[PDB]
Amino acid sequence: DTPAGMMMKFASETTKPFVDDYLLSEDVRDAVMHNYIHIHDKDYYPTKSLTCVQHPLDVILNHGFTAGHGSSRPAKRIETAAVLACISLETCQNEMHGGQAIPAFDFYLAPYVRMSYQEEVKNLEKLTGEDLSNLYDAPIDDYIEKPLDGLQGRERLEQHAINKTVNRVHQAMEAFIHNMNTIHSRVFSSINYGTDTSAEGRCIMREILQSTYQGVGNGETAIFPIQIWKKKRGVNYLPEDRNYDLYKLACKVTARRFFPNFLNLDATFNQNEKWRADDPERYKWEIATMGCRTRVFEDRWGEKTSIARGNLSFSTINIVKLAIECMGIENEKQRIDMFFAKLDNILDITAKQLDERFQFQKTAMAKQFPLLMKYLWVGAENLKPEETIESVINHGTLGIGFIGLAECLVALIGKHHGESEKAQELGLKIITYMRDRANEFSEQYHHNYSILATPAEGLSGKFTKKDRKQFGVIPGVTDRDYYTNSNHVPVYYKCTALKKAQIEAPYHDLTRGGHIFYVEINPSVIESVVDMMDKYNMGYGSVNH
Amino acid sequence: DTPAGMMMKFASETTKPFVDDYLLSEDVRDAVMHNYIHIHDKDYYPTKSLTCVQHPLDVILNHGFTAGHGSSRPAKRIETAAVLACISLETCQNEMHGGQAIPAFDFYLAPYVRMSYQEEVKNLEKLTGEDLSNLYDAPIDDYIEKPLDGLQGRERLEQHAINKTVNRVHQAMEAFIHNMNTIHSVFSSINYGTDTSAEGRCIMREILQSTYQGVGNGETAIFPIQIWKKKRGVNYLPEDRNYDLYKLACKVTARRFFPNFLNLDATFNQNEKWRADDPERYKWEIATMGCRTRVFEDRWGEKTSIARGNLSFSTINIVKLAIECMGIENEKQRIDMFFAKLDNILDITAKQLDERFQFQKTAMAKQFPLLMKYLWVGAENLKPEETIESVINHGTLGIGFIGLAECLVALIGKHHGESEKAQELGLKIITYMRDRANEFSEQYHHNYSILATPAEGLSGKFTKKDRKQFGVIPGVTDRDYYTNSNHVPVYYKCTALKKAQIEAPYHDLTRGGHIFYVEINPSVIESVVDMMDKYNMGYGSVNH
Numbered sequence A: 001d002t003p004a005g006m007m008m009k010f011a012s013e014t015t016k017p018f019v020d021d022y023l024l025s026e027d028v029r030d031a032v033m034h035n036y037i038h039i040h041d042k043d044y045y046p047t048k049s050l051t052c053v054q055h056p057l058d059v060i061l062n063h064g065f066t067a068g069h070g071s072s073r074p075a076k077r078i079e080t081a082a083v084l085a086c087i088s089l090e091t092c093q094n095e096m097h098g099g100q101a102i103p104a105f106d107f108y109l110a111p112y113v114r115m116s117y118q119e120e121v122k123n124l125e126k127l128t129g130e131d132l133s134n135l136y137d138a139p140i141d142d143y144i145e146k147p148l149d150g151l152q153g154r155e156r157l158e159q160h161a162i163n164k165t166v167n168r169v170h171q172a173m174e175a176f177i178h179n180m181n182t183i184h185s186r187v188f189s190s191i192n193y194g195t196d197t198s199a200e201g202r203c204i205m206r207e208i209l210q211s212t213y214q215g216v217g218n219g220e221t222a223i224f225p226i227q228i229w230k231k232k233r234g235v236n237y238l239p240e241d242r243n244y245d246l247y248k249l250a251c252k253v254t255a256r257r258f259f260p261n262f263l264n265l266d267a268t269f270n271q272n273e274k275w276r277a278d279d280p281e282r283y284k285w286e287i288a289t290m291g292c293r294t295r296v297f298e299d300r301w302g303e304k305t306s307i308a309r310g311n312l313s314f315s316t317i318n319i320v321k322l323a324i325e326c327m328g329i330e331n332e333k334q335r336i337d338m339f340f341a342k343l344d345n346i347l348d349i350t351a352k353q354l355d356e357r358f359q360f361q362k363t364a365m366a367k368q369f370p371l372l373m374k375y376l377w378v379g380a381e382n383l384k385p386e387e388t389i390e391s392v393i394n395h396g397t398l399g400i401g402f403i404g405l406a407e408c409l410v411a412l413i414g415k416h417h418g419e420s421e422k423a424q425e426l427g428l429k430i431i432t433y434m435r436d437r438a439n440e441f442s443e444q445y446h447h448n449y450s451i452l453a454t455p456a457e458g459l460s461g462k463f464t465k466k467d468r469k470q471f472g473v474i475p476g477v478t479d480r481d482y483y484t485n486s487n488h489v490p491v492y493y494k495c496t497a498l499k500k501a502q503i504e505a506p507y508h509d510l511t512r513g514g515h516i517f518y519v520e521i522n523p524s525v526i527e528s529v530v531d532m533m534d535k536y537n538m539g540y541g542s543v544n545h
Numbered sequence B: 001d002t003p004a005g006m007m008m009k010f011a012s013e014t015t016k017p018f019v020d021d022y023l024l025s026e027d028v029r030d031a032v033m034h035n036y037i038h039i040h041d042k043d044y045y046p047t048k049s050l051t052c053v054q055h056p057l058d059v060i061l062n063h064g065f066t067a068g069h070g071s072s073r074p075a076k077r078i079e080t081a082a083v084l085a086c087i088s089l090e091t092c093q094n095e096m097h098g099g100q101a102i103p104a105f106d107f108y109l110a111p112y113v114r115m116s117y118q119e120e121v122k123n124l125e126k127l128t129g130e131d132l133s134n135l136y137d138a139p140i141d142d143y144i145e146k147p148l149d150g151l152q153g154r155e156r157l158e159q160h161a162i163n164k165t166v167n168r169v170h171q172a173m174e175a176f177i178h179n180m181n182t183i184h185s186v187f188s189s190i191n192y193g194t195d196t197s198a199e200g201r202c203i204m205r206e207i208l209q210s211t212y213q214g215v216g217n218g219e220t221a222i223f224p225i226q227i228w229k230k231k232r233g234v235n236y237l238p239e240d241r242n243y244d245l246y247k248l249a250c251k252v253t254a255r256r257f258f259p260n261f262l263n264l265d266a267t268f269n270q271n272e273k274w275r276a277d278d279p280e281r282y283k284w285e286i287a288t289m290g291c292r293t294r295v296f297e298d299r300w301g302e303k304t305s306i307a308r309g310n311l312s313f314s315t316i317n318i319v320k321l322a323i324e325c326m327g328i329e330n331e332k333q334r335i336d337m338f339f340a341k342l343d344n345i346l347d348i349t350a351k352q353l354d355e356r357f358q359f360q361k362t363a364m365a366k367q368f369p370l371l372m373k374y375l376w377v378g379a380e381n382l383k384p385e386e387t388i389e390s391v392i393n394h395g396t397l398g399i400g401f402i403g404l405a406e407c408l409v410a411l412i413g414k415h416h417g418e419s420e421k422a423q424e425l426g427l428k429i430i431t432y433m434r435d436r437a438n439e440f441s442e443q444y445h446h447n448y449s450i451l452a453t454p455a456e457g458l459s460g461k462f463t464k465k466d467r468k469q470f471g472v473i474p475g476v477t478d479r480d481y482y483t484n485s486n487h488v489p490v491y492y493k494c495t496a497l498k499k500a501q502i503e504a505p506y507h508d509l510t511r512g513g514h515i516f517y518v519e520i521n522p523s524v525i526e527s528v529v530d531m532m533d534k535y536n537m538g539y540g541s542v543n544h
Ligand SMILES: Nc1ncnc2c1ncn2[C@H]1C[C@H](O)[C@@H](COP(=O)(O)OP(=O)(O)OP(=O)(O)O)O1
Pocket: A171, A174, A175, A176, A178, A179, A182, A217, B071, B072, B073, B074, B075, B076, B077, B080, B083, B087
């Protein structure tokens, strides 16, 4: 109970009551206290703050940032480039109410391994006068480390120059892990890597994979940052691929430290038509994600990219409450036919909730978000510091959620989708109907809408605690607490690894906002999980304990 | 208009009235709503947070800190030491409502220059097989940079190994200055000047040369606030060891208006256990922050400033009483009414400080991570829930005033820059407060002091309400922006010597804080410091 916690707690409790009675609609706020819709991050509504963003780190490292009275200059070393990444992540956090992500962590910091190598290559000609003017552009397969025991030539001062760069990058990544793990006040951070096939890129991947195995402190396991591995055929999946070595190392780390996660880049819906293996800027047309299971890929009025975009707001739905309210009728054809009428009126209600906040997030000032509306958003750099930022906000995304499929799969047929085949077919109808209605609203409201599988990181037992107080204790529904996740097989049901994958697989295509796959337990038991993610279309996956 | 600027505004607006109506006493609330006492940091009352502290960095840097789920290990390089210092100064800011100060900056960071130099030596023996096992304990006069154009043997490796340490320390100090200046969405101070070893001088020079280049495209920085410590026998006279750094500091202040100056002789900053050969002599030396705060003596402990600090302080309005005392014709009666109107308010302020002290106790050692574990004098002897009560008694409490010149014109008609009768009456209103502070310290069993408030959040609060109540009075309520504690008015044409002579005597009486302010080559700065030494000053600042 620090003073910082007691200050934000007061702020949170004095802002939500004002939001409900002065900033919402009588039609929408009616369902926000009736166990139908949960408006995420309601305490930050009066501040016109967006949720999360993928940082375009190339615009800050090349030309410095000038926020407030603090002015910086272009970086020239690995040490100063890694720190500026933390500064950007810790500064934009005070302007947005969600998480911060770095897409293409390998791509972004790759050039500054080269610059730090040229600095050493001219601090060794000072002691030893030599015209070493060719190591600037010398191709290097990778930067490796080995004993300097036996060498009597230029290589002994060449391999040593590589030898001291890895440690100067080794400490730079160890400081990155500790610095993002020391939350003093009261910071959610995520990094994705794996798709860069160069010497500079591969140096970053190994040196942060070996610092998440030793741990923080006296051997403790770190919690932040959240690390994600990007898997693509032809690069790092098959044994013949270039980065197969670094794929078989991340599975060893996950067997003792439970990181990183795995992102399936084939996925039949993560593909793009302007991705080439020879493009220096090919990282634009690749999917990146955060630890909150958020996807921002497509665009109805722009190019298909994820950099410099993000989420604006999202809300969660209670599909269990509708199903429980539909009991009593005997015939099964009418209970199911009444469920979809109770879902149409809440999807339309949710859609107006997002639009009413889109207008409020408009008419803002670019100076309310320093370092965001000047360097981080797509349409910035074309606005005076006060000119009503409106022509850059249309590229964001809006989300609609749901929770508790298994419980609503036992309120109409009696058995959930882990012990019945009739229960699995009805599960794809209660989801594919929601996906279709998002396209109608996006054309109607002139925006981007999507369907989300909510992480339930702040909604663990809010719905079931109040559902018990209304209807009672119903066997199999309100008798366990802790509603199951989006569509997962219940944790109290004995199921094998394979049978769990065949059931949760089809739903990932329908939900374009986010999804995950969880397995609870040698690295062989970890690679077999990733194999299940290729035999079917998965997208995201995680193994923990 | 940032969201973090609206959330904090909401928190303050919803927290202050609750403090007013459900946490104070009636006798103190009545005065706090009646332009007599202003309570500093009123919005942070319900959180049992203290104000400021001087960080003992040695315990953190020797054995690492474990706050929350983050665990750190002992440092081994200059970069890690500086980053750990920044982390400590940024973490404790979330547990206290005031500023953070680092005393003995050079003393604290000296050994890690040696550690980095040893690392460089052992890295340079790697390339060329040579037994350089004696440079670990080789005395060095100082670490200086020079060209390497022309030399050979076992000296261009052991002078260039020292020529790369200076760059590493230089970049470390530049990163420190820039990181303490970035506004994410923090008030910090560092004190240095008294260490005479090679490493301390290296650190002092490498930060003084960077507070001149500026931040960004050669722009003047604002943070951290830097303070220079001046002592006879070390860095004042031309014969002294650190005279060159003193002249360099004057040159930097001549164009960037930093650092300030702290007079260590002062007749009241002296200590009886300070020796020139003590490795721990920095304990018995005065340190200050940018908010004019002094924590030196102790009625129930040793005389030091490390690991101590302030708990709360409040400001008084002596102008209101003097304005209220007008109308009577004779001067003796008007003067005698003033001290009567002052005594009761002094007692009220003492009671308020004591009651807030009583509330601040009964806290938990787990409400201030790393503070009640590594940063206080009596910590490291408490279980994480043992209700700290035996470590809080070493803090301090503060009573302040504002507007001496205006109260000097409500009784006699002239302020203490145009009369000698008005200068004698200004040395009574402060000595009475000092005597009453000693009496209350004897009574309430605490430590109390008198302060000259910085007026960083009280600039025009009092004058508007006084104008609304009494009217417009020529010379009193006609100028806006009440003068500072005891300074000569800015609208009076005065030289520097006369201002120094007028303002000098008050610094001994005010043991909480004070400053001497001058508005414009290092010749002028040297003259200001000479004026400070000629009388007893303690603290001074020159800036345009
Ligand atoms: N920015 C940071 N914030 C918090 N802790 C940090 C930061 N940077 C480094 N640390 C931690 C990592 C270590 O536990 C500790 C000391 O770092 P360091 O000097 O590298 O020592 P070490 O013993 O880990 O190094 P070596 O690898 O040479 O043995 O400080």
